[PDB]
């Protein structure tokens, strides 16, 4: 599988490997012996490793992979894969994002190949890869392409022809026998396949035995890094395997000792038995195995692979705290000091390898550092550095020599940077350090930028430590060399770029040096980086931009002398980057800007001292505004975030300057060429003034007076002229673009209208002047030739009118504060009436589309709704101002009358809001109730009633889709309150609408009561779920009404309902709701309606739950129906009493009755008769507006256990039905544990079913090709069993279950695993201490341990799977032996081990969601179906009054 | 750690089969846990430990998985169980013969595993509850010194020797005093070509025997025998002829073992017995014609060089060195190791001082506390008003200010004598102010 979504030498090697023919590839891959280049990123080598994956895939698909059919592997193929595997390791070692390597699946088959050389090279890539698991963690996914467990076959110790016959264990027959491989006839016959392959190579290849011995070491090392836990690490491993491998390191050939070092380094890096590991190497000894082996590499010319692989292990020893302490006693610090200072014959690479070791051993322990200081170690390094610098100077760069200088520079910069090891700076001025440092700075060009980065981190840290020595550093020419260095260009090295400002701030300590930094323009290197295209990725990748801003802030606050040249270079750079926008690719241009603004964010508009100097609001404004009109910056980006925060700060400093400037810019672009690019400049300048106005909190007077000024308004007028001109040439500006432009204009003007209205001290006529001009212009536009943008202007006018609003402090207070008389005078209602007549006339003349006409209706109704909302007491009778207000009432009726037929799903929302405002005093309850009645005989009250008649007629002639929007509105509580209108809607079959309205209003419900006897006959074979729901709701609400002294009503309901067969799940659910209501009402009340056994329909719900979509609603219903059948009146009252007892202990304030009622609305709706009994006698601390009131084993009676036995012995065939049925039994076991005791000892035989389908799937051993349906079926079956053991105390029932569990336990390994875990789960899930201690004393009486111990002892077999099975089986028999070891009292406290595929994902996620819910929540699920998410039904209102009384 | 008599959760017959299932099983950590949980009752614990020692015995003394593997795994389980709970070690005191079977099953391969077990097993003797110590076959154990040993296996060897010295002191001394005297004869015989690096294991086994003798101490009988070792001729020949040549050729690490074995002989004391509840009384015997004090003061520089490299020598081989010999640096380093080894809770307690009266604001608070309270406190110094430095700098500035103020003219506690100070005359020092000197202390 290939990867899924540079340089010059790197680009060349990538291009060469991509182009080169497959024959020439292994010759070039060989040439790349070592990485003498900068570390690359695996992203650049995507097409390189894609071709490598492809050629490796072509070899494994040709030879066989598992079988390896062609035994003789050609030399051209074997040398091709050898070259790929070798280069891959070198590439990923020196590359970034190693986890991207997705060619691991094709690497693995080479490990188990008959080519020894390939297996070694494949394992070396896996071994190094495994070492980075603990470091990145993202690489585990990259290694998941190959099976790691199969490598355990290679682990076996290699002997001289040990086993000539491989023993194998097989499934089904379950026998283990030998297989003779000695035949050697053919390559074919001489998961078990990979293990057998290795067994062949162990005995058959004894000539190339050394190559396979080192294969086990790499395979061991990779598995040490993977999971050190599931490994053969024993006391025997330390006694012999550990010293045997370190003997190989010291004696065997380089190919062998390289792999043994890899294995030791893995155990060492993983710190497995680390105390004994260091002890095995004799690290403390002066001539130890590790100490002598260092001198072996340093002095002899050993291979570079062995030297590197050893030096890597040595560096990991210097990382270990106790190992470095033992190595210290051997004299490692004394060796490195003498070897460098005295022995000059060593190579530049080996000298660098020694410094590289000290870069770790000096930081691990303080003891070797103090010894280095005492041995004058820094002087040794300085002397060596000066020597090395002089050598390179003037000669062609020696990579090895520069790497040595780089290691000396790393060690010094890091010692100086480390606070604890600051003793290194003691012999600095005496030593050769200042001399070599100035030499490097003078000839920067001759060294790596990474060396010059360390140079700054050493010089700077030294200056900052003791600034008293700064004159000595300047005297040593170090500042003069630095200036010389700054003459040369900036390198593409982030270490250099990030370390540069730190040295500048450390040089700024001397006042004389600031004059030189300013004079020489050295600060230009810090600014020019923002405009260099090549650096942009590095400045982004690292936080260079942010770092430079912080630097400028600190430099200006500490030394405000540079403020002039910093401010000059900041705003100069801002203009230089602004100039690049036209001639730069937007993706790159936005990257350059993002980096610049990330600096700007931290450099300007800081609350800090001296910052006011480099922050010019004018300069910042002119650049930020100009940039926004050249490039489009998305809101999503952080560039927009930084730009707008600085623009908001400028706007906050002077709101007036920012607006007058963008007003002059916008009309300047209008005088220019009317081009598409100039359009986006005007659009973007409006989108920015809109953001500034919306995000503005406090507004100044001068800004408001600029908005009301004739100079600004004249520019605004020219915008409407420029924008409406674009509507003439449709080829230039499309109608869709012109609609968006029109919508921007009205959003802009509405924004300025809003800020003028919000502003305090704003005159009424000053606001009405803008409102006047703007509305009058908008109204003239909707009277032109171009009617295409009419909906856009009407939407604008809606928001214009909406501005004049009360501050909204009282809940729902919306009237016109000032614009009422203006809009009444200009006859807005009269013109809106003319707008409706004109548009409907165009439909008669067929000059407008039917769809287009309905959009005009929506626009007229939208504006009208907002206008009539603001009119004071509109449709409310008051003699004084009923002159012009009354005219508007009639206008509303006329407008609606005209466009009644032409309403839609869109227009109906506006019609509702017009009716809501017409009935406001009755709806939001402003009236005195008695006054509202006497008001009915008014011209205003009669006018609103005809509007209601229009609305009802409109709703009734609309389909299911349109009506659904306003199916449950509060207006129907008033509209349907009249018995005649209630019958009109009932006859139009909109049962849903009536249900919701009846639940809220008693007067509306009064009429529904009258229908219940009539509709009782249609309940059987109804097919309309809303009708069934209306009926069931009507019955339960009339039963609760009867609780409050009504009683006789529910008695009168007499009838017989027989439900017809239904294939529809929506109907089946509604039928069940009717049964649930009739059933639960017959529990506490006297209902004369006789129905067929709820089990007839409950079984139907179980069958339909498999095929139906949205199954939850059915499972809730069936489970609630089961509960209501079994639960008695006494048990239902006690369930409610228990819910209230939770809110009694808390002894809190709980001031209002409404709070207790709406919070416990579920409990209220379960049995209101029981709910009223508790509050009346066991009164709470409810204030109710009058001081406060006084306050303060599940054995139920009368349960109907016939349904429990019925459901227990059902046995469904269907996979899903069984899960729901077993889930139901689980709820019953919890709700009423007494149902278990009802079972006759004959009925114990049916328990076997639950144990059998639970043993079908082992939860621990995850099997292949399992289905989630099978998993949850097995789970809930076993869960039912452990629920019986924890929720009940029936000893004989548990004794029967345990007997059958113990009988099944030793039948198979699958049964042993699943039942041992089940017996454990009965105890681990501890419901109660008395229930747990009963199960605890029972399992010891039952001899459970003896059964599982004997079962595990019998299943003992020599199979690699046995180790896995043991780690599983020991967990339950450890917990169980532990409980029986600790006394009965402390046993409880003991813890463990101290769209078809889119629909399949929907049904599988449902099986996970099914759970046992608390009784409080389960009762609430019932109330949800009858109340339908209404916070207050009329039943709650009348209950509250009874409570207080 | 105490005995536990629990209900037998598993019938004793299946525990034998369970033991041999875990033994022939890789990754048996949680399997050992079940053996410990079933061994909660006395009877199963007894049967499990004896099954374990029986498996060890029959596999090596009498001779599928290999006997080497099963013996190493048998020891691995026995040692694990004795560490956890340790009421398994008390089963060795009930049988005793279990120890002799472990002792009999200890060869050149088994010695490593066997010594580690016996160090923890030795705990049964601790409560003076062995019953028949005369029939323990301990002579096999003391003779294990012939086998090659790592410093880790030797660490566990001294453990059983410490736990049994009050029972076998005369038998233990008999072997050790003889082996060291024969080893010292061997150095003296090959003195012409003696190299402490070449003859390393020899001097290591010698320093091992000498240290073992010091652990138990001499008896009034071995007093004549003790001085014979302290005055062996090889000692004189080494420090007067070999040592000078070895200094210019060998590494200090190789020379140290002879200085250790030599310091140990003259460190050995005559111990009487366990008069106390746990501790056993000591007595220092002295030498006469020996060149010990002479050699130690002549090589006091090389001895201190060894202590530079390894300060834990003053707690082991050179523990009985005269602290006179220690150079100020090593003497101060040892002083700090000894005071810090007594770990007691160090609570951070805040101190509010004024820049003007650092002495009085400290005296007022510190003197309300006692010596134990002031010794263990982590004084969190907080100079009033001025808050501009780290807690480590404030701690130092507080000491620095106290030293400036104590030698104060207005305090008049001390009168100068140039750079140094001495207390002010007892007539000038005020009676109520004498307490200021306790505070300076």
């Amino acid at each position: 599988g290939p990867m899924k979504i540079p340089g010059k030498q790197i680009s060349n090697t990538i291009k060469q490997l991509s182009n080169l023919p497959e024959e020439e590839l292994p010759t070039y891959l060989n040439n790349i012996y070592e990485w003498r280049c900068a570390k690359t990123d695996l992203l650049y080598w995507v097409d390189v490793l894609d071709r490598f994956d492809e050629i490796l895939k072509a070899v494994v698909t040709e030879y066989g992979l598992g079988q390896f059919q062609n035994k003789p592997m050609k030399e051209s193929d074997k040398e091709m894969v050898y070259a790929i595997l070798k280069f891959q390791k070198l590439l990923v070692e020196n590359s970034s994002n190693k986890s991207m390597f997705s060619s691991f699946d094709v690497v693995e088959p080479f490990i188990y190949s008959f080519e020894l050389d390939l297996a070694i090279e494949a394992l070396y890539l896996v071994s190094f890869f495994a070492s980075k698991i603990h470091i990145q963690r993202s690489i585990k996914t990259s290694m998941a392409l190959m099976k790691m467990e199969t490598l355990k076959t290679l682990i076996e110790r290699v002997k001289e022809k040990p086993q000539s016959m491989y023993t194998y264990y097989d499934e089904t027959t379950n026998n283990c026998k030998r297989v003779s491989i000695k035949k050697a006839v053919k390559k074919g016959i001489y998961q078990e396949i990979r293990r057998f392959i290795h067994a062949i190579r162990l005995h058959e290849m004894a000539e190339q035995h050394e190559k396979l011995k080192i294969i086990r070491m790499l395979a061991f090392s990779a598995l040490v890094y993977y999971n050190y836990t599931d490994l053969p690490i024993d006391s025997e491993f330390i006694s012999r395997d550990l010293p045997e491998t370190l003997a190989i390191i010291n004696t065997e050939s380089y190919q062998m000792r390289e792999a043994a070092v890899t294995m030791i380094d893995a155990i060492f890096r993983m710190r497995i038995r680390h105390s004994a590991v260091i002890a095995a190497m004799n690290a403390q000894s002066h001539e130890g195995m590790i100490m002598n082996l260092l001198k072996k590499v340093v002095n002899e010319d050993v291979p570079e692979h062995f030297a590197i692989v050893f030096f890597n292990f040595l560096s990991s020893c210097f990382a270990s705290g106790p190992c470095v302490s033992a190595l210290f006693s051997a004299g490692i610090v004394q060796y490195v000091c003498n070897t460098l200072r005295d022995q000059p014959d060593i190579s530049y690479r080996k000298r660098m390898r020694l410094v590289m070791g000290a870069n770790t051993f000096l930081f691990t322990l303080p003891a070797p550092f103090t010894w280095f200081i005492s041995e004058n170690g820094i002087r040794i390094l300085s002397k060596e550095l000066l020597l090395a610098v002089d050598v390179a100077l003037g000669n062609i760069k020696d990579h090895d020599l520069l790497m040595y200088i780089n290691s000396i520079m790393k060690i010094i910069s890091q010692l100086f940077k480390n606070a604890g090891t600051a003793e290194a700076m003691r012999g600095f001025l005496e030593g050769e350090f200042p001399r070599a440092i100035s030499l490097i700075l003078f000839h920067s060009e001759e060294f790596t930028p990474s060396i010059l980065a360390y140079l700054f981190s050493a010089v700077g840290d030294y200056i900052h430590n003791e600034p008293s020595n700064l004159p000595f550093i300047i005297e040593a020419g170090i500042f003069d060399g630095f200036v010389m260095c700054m003459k040369k260009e900036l390198p593409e090295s982030p270490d250099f770029l990030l370390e540069l400002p730190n040295l500048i701030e450390a040089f700024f300590l001397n006042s004389e040096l600031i004059k030189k930094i300013d004079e020489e323009n050295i600060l230009d290197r810090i600014f020019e980086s923002f405009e260099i295209v090549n650096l942009s990725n590095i400045i982004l990748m690292y936080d260079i931009g942010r770092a430079y801003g912080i630097f400028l802030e600190n430099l200006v606050r500490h030394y405000p002398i540079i403020s002039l040249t910093v401010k000059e270079k900041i705003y100069n750079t801002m203009k230089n980057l602004e100039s690049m926008i036209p001639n730069t690719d937007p993706e790159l241009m936005r990257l350059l800007l993002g980096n610049l603004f990330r600096m700007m964010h931290r450099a300007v508009y800081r609350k800090t001292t001296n910052n006011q100097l480099i922050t010019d609001k004018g300069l910042l404004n002119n650049r930020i505004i100009s940039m926004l009109m050249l490039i489009e910056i998305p809101t999503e980006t952080e560039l927009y975030t930084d730009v707008m925060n600085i623009l908001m700060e400028v706007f906050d400093e002077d709101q007036t300057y920012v607006i007058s400037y963008i007003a002059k810019v916008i009309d300047r672009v209008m005088k220019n060429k009317v081009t598409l690019e100039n359009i986006e400049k005007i659009k973007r300048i409006l989108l920015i003034v809109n953001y500034l106005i919306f995000k503005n909190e406090e507004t100044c007077e001068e800004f408001i007076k600029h908005c009301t000024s004739k100079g600004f308004l004249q520019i605004v007028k020219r915008i409407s002229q420029y924008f409406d001109n674009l509507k003439k040439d449709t080829a230039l500006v499309s109608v869709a673009k012109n609609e968006s432009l029109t919508n921007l204009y009205y959003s802009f003007t509405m924004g300025i209208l809003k800020t003028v209205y919000r502003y305090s001290k704003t005159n009424a006529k000053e606001y009405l002047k803008i409102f006047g001009l703007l509305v009058e212009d908008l109204l003239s536009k909707t009277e032109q030739i171009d009617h295409l943008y009419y909906t856009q202007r009407m939407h604008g006018l809606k928001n214009y009118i909406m501005v004049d609003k009360s501050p909204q402090q009282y809940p729902q207070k919306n009237e016109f504060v000032v614009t009422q008389e203006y809009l009444m005078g200009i006859n807005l209602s009269e013109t809106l009436m003319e707008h409706a007549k004109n548009s409907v006339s165009m439909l008669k003349d067929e000059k407008i589309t039917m769809d287009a006409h309905k959009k005009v209706v929506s626009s007229i109704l939208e504006v009208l709704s907002i206008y009539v909302r603001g009119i004071k007491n509109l449709f409310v009778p008051v003699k004084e101002p009923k002159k012009k207000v009354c005219e508007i009432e009639e206008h509303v009726l006329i407008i609606v009358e005209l466009l009644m037929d032409y309403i839609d799903k869109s227009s109906i929302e506006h019609l509702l809001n017009i009716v809501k405002t017409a009935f406001f005093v009755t709806l939001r309850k402003q009236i005195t109730k008695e006054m509202d009645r006497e008001n009915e005989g008014s011209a205003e009250y009669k006018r609103r009633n005809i509007l209601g008649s229009f609305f009802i007629s409109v709703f009734l002639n609309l389909p299911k889709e349109e009506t659904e929007a306003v199916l449950k509105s509060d207006i129907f509580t008033i509209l349907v309150k009249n018995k005649k209108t209630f019958k009109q809607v009932y006859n139009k079959n909109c049962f849903g609408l009536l249900q919701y309205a009846a639940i809220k209003e008693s007067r509306v419900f009064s009429h529904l009561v009258s229908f219940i006897p009539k509709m009782t006959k249609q309940v059987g074979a109804s097919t309309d779920p809303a009708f069934l729901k209306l009926y069931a709701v009507g019955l339960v609400f009339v039963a609760m009404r009867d609780t409050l002294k009504k009683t006789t009503v529910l008695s009168r309901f007499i009838g017989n309902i027989v439900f017809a067969e239904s294939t529809c799940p929506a109907v089946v659910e509604a039928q069940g709701i009717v049964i649930l209501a009739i059933v639960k009402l017959k529990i506490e009340y006297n209902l004369a309606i006789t129905i067929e056994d709820p089990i007839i329909h409950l079984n139907r719900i179980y069958a339909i739950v498999e095929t139906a979509e949205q199954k939850e609603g059915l499972v809730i219903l069936a489970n609630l129906l089961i509960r209501r059948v079994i639960e008695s009146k006494e048990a239902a009252k006690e369930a409610v009493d228990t819910i209230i007892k939770n809110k009694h202990l808390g002894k809190s304030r709980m001031y209002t009755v409404h709070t207790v009622c709406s919070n416990l609305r579920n409990a209220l709706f379960y049995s209101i008769s029981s709910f009223l009994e508790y509050l009346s006698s066991n009164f709470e601390c409810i204030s109710a507006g009058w001081e406060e009131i006084r306050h303060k084993i599940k054995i139920y009676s009368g349960l109907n256990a016939e349904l429990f036995r019925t459901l227990f012995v059902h046995r469904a065939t269907g996979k899903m039905e069984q899960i729901v049925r077993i889930h139901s039994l689980c709820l019953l076991v919890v709700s009423f544990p007494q149902l278990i005791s009802t079972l006759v000892p004959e009925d114990y035989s049916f328990f076997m079913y639950f144990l059998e389908n639970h043993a079908a799937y082992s939860k621990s051993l995850k099997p292949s090709a399992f289905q989630q349906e099978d998993k949850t079926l097995a789970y809930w079956s076993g869960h039912f069993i452990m629920l019986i053991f924890n929720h009940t105390t029936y000893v004989e029932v548990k004794k029967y279950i345990l007997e059958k569990v113990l009988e099944l336990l030793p039948t198979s390994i699958n049964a042993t695993v699943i039942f041992s875990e089940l017996i454990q789960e009965i105890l681990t899930m501890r419901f109660s201490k008395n229930t747990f201690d009963e199960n605890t004393a029972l399992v010891k009486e039952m001899n459970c341990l003896e059964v599982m111990i004997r079962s595990t002892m019998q299943i003992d077999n020599r199979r690699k799977d046995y180790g896995s099975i043991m780690e599983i089986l020991t967990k339950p028999m450890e917990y169980i032996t532990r409980i029986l070891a600790v006394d009965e009292k402390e046993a409880f406290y003991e813890e463990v081990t101290q769209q078809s595929s889119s629909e399949q994902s929907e049904k599988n996620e449902f099986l996970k969601s099914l759970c046992i819910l608390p009784i409080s929540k389960l009762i609430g699920k019932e109330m949800e179906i009858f109340n339908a998410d209404e916070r207050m039904p009329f039943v709650q209102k009348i209950l509250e009054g009874s409570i207080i009384s | 750690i105490a005995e536990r008599e629990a209900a037998a959760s598993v019938p004793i017959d299946i525990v034998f089969g369970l033991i041999h299932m875990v033994l022939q099983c890789g990754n048996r950590r949680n399997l050992y846990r079940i053996i410990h949980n079933i061994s909660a009752n006395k009877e199963v614990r007894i049967f499990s430990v004896e099954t374990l020692v029986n498996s060890i015995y029959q596999a090596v003394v009498e001779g599928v998985i290999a006997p080497e593997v099963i013996t190493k795994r048998g020891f691995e389980a026995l040692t694990y169980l004795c560490t956890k709970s340790s009421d398994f070690t008390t089963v060795f005191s009930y049988n005793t013969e279990l120890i002799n079977k472990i002792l009999q099953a200890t060869n050149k391969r088994t010695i490593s595993e066997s010594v580690k077990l016996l160090s923890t097993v030795g705990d049964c003797f601790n409560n003076d509850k062995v019953a028949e110590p005369e029939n323990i076959e301990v002579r096999k154990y003391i003779g294990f010194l012939e086998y090659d040993m790592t410093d880790d296996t030797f660490k566990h060897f001294c453990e059983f020797i410490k736990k049994t010295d009050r029972f076998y002191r005369p038998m233990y001394l008999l072997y050790l005093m003889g082996g060291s005297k024969k080893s010292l004869e061997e150095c003296l015989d090959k003195k012409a070509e003696f190299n402490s690096h070449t003859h390393h294991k020899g001097i290591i086994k010698l320093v091992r025997m000498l240290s073992l003798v010091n652990i138990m101490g001499i008896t009034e009988t071995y007093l004549d025998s003790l001085m014979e070792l302290r005055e062996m001729p090889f000692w004189e020949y080494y420090f007067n002829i070999i040592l000078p040549k070895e200094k210019e050729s060998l590494y200090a690490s190789s020379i140290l073992p002879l200085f250790k074995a030599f310091v140990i002989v003259h460190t050995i004391q005559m111990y009487i017995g366990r008069n106390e509840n746990i501790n056993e009384f000591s007595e220092i015997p002295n030498s006469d014609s020996s060149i010990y004090y002479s050699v130690v003061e002549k090589e006091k520089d090389l001895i201190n060089t060894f202590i530079q490299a390894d300060p834990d020598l003053l707690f082991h081989a050179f523990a009985g060195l005269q602290k006179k010999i220690l150079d100020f640096d090593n003497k101060r380093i040892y002083f700090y190791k000894k005071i810090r080894e007594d770990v007691q809770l160090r609570p951070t307690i805040s101190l509010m001082v004024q820049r003007g009266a650092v002495f009085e604001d400290t005296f007022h608070q510190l003197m309300r506390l006692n010596g134990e309270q002031v010794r263990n406190a982590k004084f969190n110094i907080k100079f009033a008003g001025e808050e501009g430095v780290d807690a480590g700098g404030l701690t130092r500035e507080w000491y620095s200010e106290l030293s400036k103020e104590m030698f104060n003219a207005n305090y008049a506690l001390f009168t100068p004598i140039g750079s140094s100070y001495q207390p002010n005359h007892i007539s000038h020092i005020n009676p109520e102010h004498l307490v200021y000197f306790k505070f300076i202390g």
Side-chain angles (χ1 to χ4, degrees), chain A residues 1061-1158:
Chain A
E1061 83 84 44
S1062 186
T1063 51
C1064 177
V1067 173
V1068 164
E1069 181 191 20
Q1071 291 181 146
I1073 296 163
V1074 174
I1075 305 151
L1076 178 61
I1078 295 176
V1079 165
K1080 89 168 188 292
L1081 291 179
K1082 286 156 89 61
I1083 302 287
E1084 296 192 330
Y1085 304 128
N1086 268 33
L1087 180 61
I1089 298 164
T1090 77
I1091 59 120
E1092 42 187 0
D1093 186 20
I1095 326 171
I1096 221 165
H1097 183 79
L1098 192 86
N1099 287 337
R1100 224 187 309 253
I1101 292 174
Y1102 277 131
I1104 206 61
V1105 92
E1106 187 163 337
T1107 68
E1109 192 213 9
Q1110 315 290 342
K1111 308 165 177 61
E1112 192 172 310
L1114 288 174
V1115 187
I1116 299 171
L1117 173 70
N1119 265 119
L1120 286 169
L1121 181 56
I1122 288 165
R1123 179 174 181 94
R1124 287 305 212 164
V1125 161
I1126 299 171
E1127 183 182 52
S1128 70
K1129 183 205 175 312
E1130 300 79 11
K1133 177 164 297 182
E1134 197 52 50
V1136 165
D1137 285 16
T1138 309
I1139 305 305
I1140 317 161
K1141 284 163 194 174
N1142 310 344
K1143 314 273 279 173
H1144 179 272
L1145 277 173
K1147 63 193 180 301
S1148 189
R1149 25 100 190 92
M1150 312 302 189
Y1151 40 96
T1152 170
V1153 189
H1154 178 91
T1155 282
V1156 186
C1157 300
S1158 64

Side-chain angles (χ1 to χ4, degrees), chain A residues 351-405:
Chain A
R351 265 188 261 192
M352 175 217 65
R353 283 277 136 79
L354 293 198
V355 182
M356 253 162 56
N359 247 313
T360 46
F361 66 64
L362 296 178
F363 296 98
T364 303
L365 231 73
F369 176 65
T370 64
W371 185 269
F372 194 65
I373 294 296
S374 83
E375 287 248 23
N376 210 5
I378 260 62
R379 153 66 64 135
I380 294 163
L381 294 173
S382 73
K383 231 151 185 162
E384 262 301 319
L385 175 85
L386 179 61
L387 274 166
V389 162
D390 280 336
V391 172
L393 279 170
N395 303 90
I396 293 182
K397 289 190 192 188
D398 182 9
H399 176 83
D400 284 355
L401 168 54
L402 285 160
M403 293 312 297
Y404 179 45
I405 300 170

Side-chain angles (χ1 to χ4, degrees), chain A residues 986-1053:
Chain A
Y986 174 84
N987 282 25
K988 211 69 169 73
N989 298 352
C990 59
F991 313 112
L993 172 107
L994 277 74
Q995 179 198 322
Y996 295 117
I999 288 167
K1000 302 185 282 190
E1001 181 62 40
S1002 65
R1003 298 270 77 252
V1004 170
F1005 183 72
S1006 172
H1007 307 128
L1008 176 61
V1009 173
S1010 318
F1011 286 109
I1012 303 177
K1014 318 168 182 171
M1015 63 190 183
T1016 302
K1017 305 155 183 179
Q1018 296 116 291
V1019 180
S1022 175
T1023 75
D1024 187 301
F1027 179 38
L1028 289 143
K1029 283 189 190 84
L1030 172 65
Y1031 174 76
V1033 160
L1035 280 178
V1036 63
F1037 268 85
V1038 88
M1040 298 191 188
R1041 204 190 62 183
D1042 280 31
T1043 301
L1044 308 172
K1045 74 182 178 287
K1046 198 79 177 181
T1047 287
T1048 51
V1049 176
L1050 199 70
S1051 162
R1052 309 164 193 166
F1053 288 135

Side-chain angles (χ1 to χ4, degrees), chain A residues 732-780:
Chain A
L732 185 56
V733 201
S734 305
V735 289
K737 194 74 163 190
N738 265 131
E739 271 166 341
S740 170
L741 284 162
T742 315
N743 279 330
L744 168 65
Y745 177 62
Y746 291 127
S747 286
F748 158 75
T749 57
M750 184 220 61
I752 31 181
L753 274 174
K754 265 185 181 184
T755 45
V756 168
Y757 186 79
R758 178 184 48 78
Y759 183 58
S760 300
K761 305 169 291 304
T762 227
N763 287 120
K765 215 65 203 176
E766 192 55 87
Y767 175 74
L768 294 172
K769 178 169 149 290
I770 316 170
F771 196 108
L773 173 63
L774 258 60
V775 160
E776 284 157 54
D777 172 49
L778 208 158
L779 288 168
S780 71

